[PDB]
Design an enzyme around this catalytic site. Structure first.
Site, mmCIF file in Angstrom:
data_model
loop_
_atom_site.group_PDB
_atom_site.id
_atom_site.type_symbol
_atom_site.label_atom_id
_atom_site.label_comp_id
_atom_site.label_asym_id
_atom_site.label_seq_id
_atom_site.Cartn_x
_atom_site.Cartn_y
_atom_site.Cartn_z
ATOM 1 N N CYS A 75 0.803 -1.214 0.000
ATOM 2 C CA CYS A 75 0.000 0.000 0.000
ATOM 3 C C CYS A 75 0.842 1.273 0.000
ATOM 4 C CB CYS A 75 -1.017 -0.008 1.171
ATOM 5 S SG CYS A 75 -0.360 0.058 2.853
ATOM 6 N N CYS A 157 -1.630 3.777 0.867
ATOM 7 C CA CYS A 157 -1.429 4.221 2.242
ATOM 8 C C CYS A 157 -0.084 4.971 2.368
ATOM 9 C CB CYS A 157 -1.467 3.003 3.186
ATOM 10 S SG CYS A 157 0.078 2.042 3.102
#
Ligand SMILES: *[C@H]1O[C@H](COP(=O)(O)O)[C@@H](O)[C@H]1F
Ligand SMILES: NC(=O)c1cccnc1
Length: 252
Positions: A75, A157
């Site tokens: 991520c 992320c």
């Protein structure tokens, strides 16, 4: 005939065989995708658009395909890019820990391909397909990319990086897929920072393009989403490429 239904280029030749072969190659190279049934993936891809009016495609049409092509991407290692396709992919072909959308299974299957069907018939249209601007927005190719781009942005992320083309009129373009889909689908709960790499053209190695009006617009949009914005100039892309390809190079 002497007349095509649509204004865009038609389906890529041998489309079914190409998607299948790309799925085979990807699932053999990437060990996490070993469980994927390529024939099933292709069947899911077909069902999204065959026999459907090519101006009435829906994100839900692609749901069985999205489910089969589910993939966990690291991520914190996402590279977004806008209008600088070649350099972004040269970068991830060398820096193998970072991923663009086209390095995922579904992105890789569809990269540089065109496809559409015909309403009330089972055939693929190899003559022409709807152009997003001249014909209709809800076409198989455009809907596919919007769907997978949203999902890719939603997976990001920590620090997400975006490569931008500093030699363009609008370095950040709100109407690009980056600007219209990906920026608005980063999750503020997960994403700490969006860091732009503004790649300069050859010759112009001095101007601070992080102060460009459209970069400032990007900064404002991202900031108002409660994500931090960071920007770096890549003043000399040749040196950048030298260093990516050989990071032990003591000039780097
Ligand atoms: C999704 O969209 C961008 C490339 O599209 P564009 O901005 O050049 O229109 C990539 O980051 C993909 F993830
Ligand atoms: N929406 C698109 O055309 C697109 C192209 C390349 C990568 N991601 C999205």
């Amino acid at each position: 005939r002497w007349r095509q239904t649509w204004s865009g280029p038609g389906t890529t030749k041998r489309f079914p065989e190409t998607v299948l072969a790309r799925c085979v190659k990807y699932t053999e190279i990437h060990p996490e995708m070993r469980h994927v049934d390529c024939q099933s993936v292709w069947d899911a891809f077909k069902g999204a658009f065959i026999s459907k009016h090519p101006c009435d495609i829906t994100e839900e049409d692609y749901q069985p395909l999205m489910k089969l092509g589910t993939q966990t991407v690291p991520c914190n290692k996402i590279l977004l890019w806008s209008r600088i396709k070649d350099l972004a992919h040269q970068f991830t072909q060398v820096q193998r820990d970072m991923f663009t959308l086209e390095d995922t299974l579904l992105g890789y299957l569809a990269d540089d391909l065109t496809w559409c069907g015909e309403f009330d018939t089972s055939k693929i249209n190899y003559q022409s397909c709807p152009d997003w601007r001249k014909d209709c927005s809800n076409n198989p190719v455009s809907v596919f990319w919007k769907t997978v781009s949203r999902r890719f942005a939603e997976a990001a992320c920590d620090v997400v990086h975006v490569m931008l083309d500093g030699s363009r009129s609008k370095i950040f373009d709100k109407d690009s897929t980056f600007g219209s889909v990906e920026v608005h689908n980063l999750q503020p709960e997960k994403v700490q920072t969006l860091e732009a790499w503004v790649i300069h053209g050859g010759r112009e190695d001095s101007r601070d393009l992080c102060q460009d009006p459209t970069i400032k617009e990007l900064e404002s949009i991202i900031s108002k989403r409660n994500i931090q914005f960071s920007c770096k100039n890549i003043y000399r892309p040749d040196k950048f490429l030298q260093c990516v390809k050989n990071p032990e190079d003591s000039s780097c």
